[PDB]
Design a protein around this ligand. Structure first.
Ligand SMILES: *[C@H]1[C@H]([NH3+])[C@@H](CO)[C@H](O)[C@H]1O
Length: 499
């Protein structure tokens, strides 16, 4: 065993958690749409061809917001190709994923799906091959009530009431050499500025997300953000961050430390936003949208075998293991501990593609290992993130020094009279004996202690069998105004307090 302490003080707050940090992401990629949310031949398809089993799995995650339709796809996409009668929708070469896109699903059918799962849509505009005119027309088509060509066109297409989309993305991954219509930071900042202006002139109620770096390792990291915000600050509301992690070197202790890098990435982009705020003498604070995050690496060799120009290829289908779920849990706690400045985040992606939900053709939908920590964070993690004072033992790895064994934060929900403690024990050998000072919370009790643990960090789930599932047999006890809890070696823990 090892000992760790954590102070839970009601009056030391980070911020209200914006529920949109529990967002996700659907792109026209692989089987995310075709075979994922939408499968007209499926025995459990609804009247509109949407898989009811996937709808239930999404509703249980309580995802408030879903980014759509990309992703790398968007930068070559024409939105008019996916609206109106199906017979007039063209078949296109999607250059992002070397696939044929039929456009059988486009934005109005995605809005119908989003309504069934209770999610708002974070709509992306193409700033690769397209620009300001397309951006204003899309906003008008979606948001203007009637009495103009594009608003009456949406009505003619069957959608009388406007979609009233609140939050929009100004392009996707524009810094990447892999992007269709890549732009330098100046080129991007300029077209994002001018697109943002005409979008907000159509509908001043909207909010805009400007594109940050595609990952912390970009050669343009930080320089990009500063230039793009210099060009856009007065017209935009958020800046994005993207990051995937993987365990390519089979080093569990170094892998689980990677959330420390994610923490650095967040604090760095906040600093940039506040630099440019000061440069401009602006009163407005720009916040972060962490609108692509997950584990990704398993599918790299399978992906290389897929021939180009198929419909709905089985691309980017990682099968997650137990250690992947532990890192996802560390990433979620990292988002929560930044609730003051991270207001939107998207688990990338929701179905089949780098995803917590997987499907089989004509067959079942199932929960990956990573589904459970995401569900727990979304369902139990609404309220105020408290500022922790942690005393934890530490270890050093290949890439990181003084890595706490304990990753933890507490969320206080005043309306429910609940305090929830999320905790990962990174220790590969020892139980962590955690003592939490809750003197500041009068007359509380342990409701339950949920634990996700498995002896084999490489164990996966499948359609047939889910060996990696939570139990409710955690030993957390509240006495003498202290919560004492055993966190098993290599575990995710949700300790729920109320009364
Ligand atoms: C971010 C990811 N690398 C891709 C899959 O989720 C997506 O298209 C990019 O924007």
């Amino acid at each position: 065993t090892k000992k760790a302490t954590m102070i839970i003080e009601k009056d030391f707050k980070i911020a209200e958690i914006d529920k949109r940090i529990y967002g996700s992401f659907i792109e026209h990629l692989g089987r995310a749409v075709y075979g994922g949310i939408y499968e007209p031949g499926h025995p459990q398809a609804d009247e509109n061809g949407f898989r009811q089993d996937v709808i239930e799995l999404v509703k249980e995650l309580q995802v408030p917001i879903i980014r759509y339709p990309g992703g790398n796809f968007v930068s070559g996409y024409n939105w008019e190709d996916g609206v109106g009668p199906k017979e007039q929708r063209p078949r296109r070469l999607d250059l992002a994923w070397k696939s044929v896109e039929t456009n059988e699903i486009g934005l109005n059918e995605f809005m119908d799906w989003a309504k069934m799962v209770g999610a708002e849509v974070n709509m992306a505009v193409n700033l690769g091959t397209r620009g300001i005119d397309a951006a204003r027309n899309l906003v008008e088509y979606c948001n203007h009530p009637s009495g103009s060509y594009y608003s009456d066109l949406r009505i003619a297409h069957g959608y009388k009431e406007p979609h009233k989309i609140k939050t929009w993305c100004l392009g996707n991954e524009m810094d990447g050499p892999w992007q269709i219509g890549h732009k330098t930071a100046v080129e991007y900042g300029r077209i994002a500025c001018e697109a943002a202006k005409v979008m907000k002139w159509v509908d001043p109620t909207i909010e805009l997300v400007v594109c940050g770096s595609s990952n912390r390792n970009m050669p343009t990291f930080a320089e990009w953000e500063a230039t793009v915000l210099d060009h856009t600050y007065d017209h935009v509301d958020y800046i994005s961050l993207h990051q995937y992690y993987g365990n390519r070197d089979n080093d569990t202790a170094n892998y689980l430390a990677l959330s420390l890098e994610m923490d650095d990435f967040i604090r760095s982009v906040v600093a940039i936003a506040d630099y440019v705020k000061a440069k401009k003498r602006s009163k407005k604070t720009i916040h972060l949208s962490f609108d692509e995050w997950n584990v990704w690496y398993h599918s790299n060799e399978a992906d290389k075998l897929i021939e180009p120009w198929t419909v709905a290829p089985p691309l980017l289908e990682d099968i997650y293991n137990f250690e992947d779920a532990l890192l996802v849990g560390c990433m979620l706690i990292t988002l929560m501990k930044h609730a003051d400045r991270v207001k939107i985040a998207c688990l990338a992606q929701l179905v089949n593609v780098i995803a917590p939900i997987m499907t089989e053709k004509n067959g079942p939908a199932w929960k990956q290992t990573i589904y459970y920590p995401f569900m727990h964070a979304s369902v139990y993690g609404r309220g105020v993130a408290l500022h922790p004072v942690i005393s934890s033992p530490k270890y050093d790895s290949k890439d990181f020094t003084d890595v706490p064994y304990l990753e933890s934060i507490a969320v206080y929900n005043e309306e429910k009279e609940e305090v929830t403690i999320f905790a990962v024990n990174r220790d590969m050998e020892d139980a962590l004996l955690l003592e939490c000072d809750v003197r500041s919370f009068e007359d509380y009790r342990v409701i339950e202690h949920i634990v996700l643990e498995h002896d084999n960090v490489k164990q996966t789930n499948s359609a047939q069998s889910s060996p990696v599932v939570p139990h409710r047999n955690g030993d957390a006890q509240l006495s003498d105004r202290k919560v004492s809890a055993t966190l098993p070696k290599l575990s995710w823990n949700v300790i729920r307090l109320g009364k």
